[PDB]
Amino acid sequence: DQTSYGDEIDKFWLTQYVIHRESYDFYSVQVDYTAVGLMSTPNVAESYQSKFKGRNGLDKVLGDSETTRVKINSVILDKPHGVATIRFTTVRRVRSNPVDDQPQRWIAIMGYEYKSLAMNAEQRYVNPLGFRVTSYRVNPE
Amino acid sequence: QTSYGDEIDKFWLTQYVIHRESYDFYSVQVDYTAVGLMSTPNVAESYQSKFKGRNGLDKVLGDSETTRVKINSVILDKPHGVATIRFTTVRRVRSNPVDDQPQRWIAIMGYEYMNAEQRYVNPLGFRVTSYRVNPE
Ligand SMILES: O=C(O)c1ccnc(Cl)c1
C-alpha cells in the first residue's frame, strides 16, 4: 500500500493501462478487459465496463471489423500525489477501409495507488503489485 | 510466485540492460547499486570487478564521456526463465562536438524470482543469475 513505487515502475503500469484501455484488438480483448478490472477502482471500472454490457457490447458489435493501436508519446509524473499525465496517439484501421484512419491525439489525467489486497493465483499474473487507477479522463490537444 | 506475465518480464530485462550497458557518470552508484540489487553477487561481482579497485571504470572515464542504450526488440523463453534482448549503443565524448557512430549488440540473460531500500527498486526479488553480450 504505497502510492508510488518508482518513476520507471509507475511509468510502466500507467502506459500498460492506457494501451489496455484505449487499444482495440479482438485478440486479447478479454485480458485487456480483465487487466483494467484489476487495475481500477470499481467506480472507475464501472465506467469502463459499461461499453461491454448488453447485445451492443463493443466486442459483440465491432468484433474484428476494425482495430485501434496505441502509441505512448510522453509521460509526466506527480509522484507524491499519485497523479500522472500522459499524451498518446490512437490510429484506427478498418479492414473495410483501404488505409488506416487519421491519427487522434489525447491527454490522459490519472490518479493511482498500490493497495494491500489479498489476491488469488490468477489476479497476480496481470497485476502483481496491486496497482490500480483511481481517476481517469481523456481529452484532445 | 513463479509466473508473472510476459510484458513485465520484458520490462525488467530491458531496463536492466539499460542499467548495466549504459554509461552516464550521474546515478552510477545507484545504478551500480540497483544492478547490484537486481543481481546475484556471483554474476554481479563480474559487473563489480570492472568497477572496483584502482582500475575502476568510473575512475577512468569519469565524466568525460557517456554511453546510452536504445532497445530494439525483446523475445522471451518463459518456462526456463530465459530471455534475449537486442540493443544499440551510442557513445559520446564530451570533448568531441558530436556523437560516436552506433554499434549493435545482443544480450543473453538468465533470471528468476526486505528493508526500506530493496523494495522500492525491486519489490519482487527479481534477480539476474547469468549475463553475456555478443555482436551481430
Ligand atoms: O476503440 C477504442 O479506442 C476503444 C474504446 C474503449 N475500450 C477499448 Cl479496449 C478500445
Alpha helix (H) residue ranges in B22-115:
28-37, 41-48, 57-61
Q: How far is the CA of A21 from the centre of ligand 1 (A)?
A: 6
User: How far apart are alpha carbons B68 and B22 in whole angstroms?
Assistant: 5
E strand or H helix that includes residue A37: helix A29-38
Residues with CB under 6 A from ligand 1: A 21-22, 24, 32, 51, 68, 90
CATH code of the domain in which B112 resides: 3.10.450.230
Lookup: cell for A24 = 482495440
DSSP A11: H
User: How far apart are alpha carbons A57 and A59 in whole angstroms?
Assistant: 5
Amino acid at B91: R
Q: Which residue has the cell 487519421?
A: A102
- Beta strands per DSSP E along A21-115: 66-78, 83-94, 104-114
Residues B41, B44, B46: CA angle, nearest 5 degrees: 115
Among B103, B76, B107, which Cα is nearest to B92's? B103
What radius of gyration, in Å, describes the C-alpha atoms of chain A?
16
Lookup: cell for A5 = 513505487
Beta carbons within 10 angstroms of residue A75's beta carbon? 18
Q: Which residue has the cell 523463453?
A: B77
Method: X-ray
Instruction: Flag if B8 and A128 touch (Cβ within 8 Å).
Output: yes
- Collapsing DSSP states into helix, strand and coil, what is residue A122? coil
Asked if B49 and B100 touch (Cβ cutoff 8 Å), the reply is no
Lookup: cell for B102 = 552506433
Q: Characterize the bridge pairing of strands B103-112 and B82-93.
A: antiparallel
Lookup: cell for B129 = 543469475
User: How far apart are alpha carbons A141 and B3 in whole angstroms?
Assistant: 40
Lookup: cell for A100 = 488506416
Q: Which residue has the cell 536492466?
A: B16
Beta carbons within 10 angstroms of residue B125's beta carbon? 11
Q: Looking at beta carbons, which residues of chain B come within 8 Å of A18?
A: none
Data resolution in angstroms:
2.8
Beta carbons within 10 angstroms of residue A116's beta carbon? 7
Which residue in A3, A12, A31, A122 has the most chain B C-beta atoms within 10 A of its own C-beta, making it the best mutation to test that interface? A12
Q: How many contacts, defined by CB atoms under 8 Å, are there between A and B?
A: 22
Q: Domain of A99?
A: 1-141
Beta carbons within 10 angstroms of residue A63's beta carbon? 10
Q: Report the domain count for chain A.
A: 1
Which residue in A1, A3, A7, A8 has the most chain B C-beta atoms within 10 A of its own C-beta, making it the best mutation to test that interface? A8
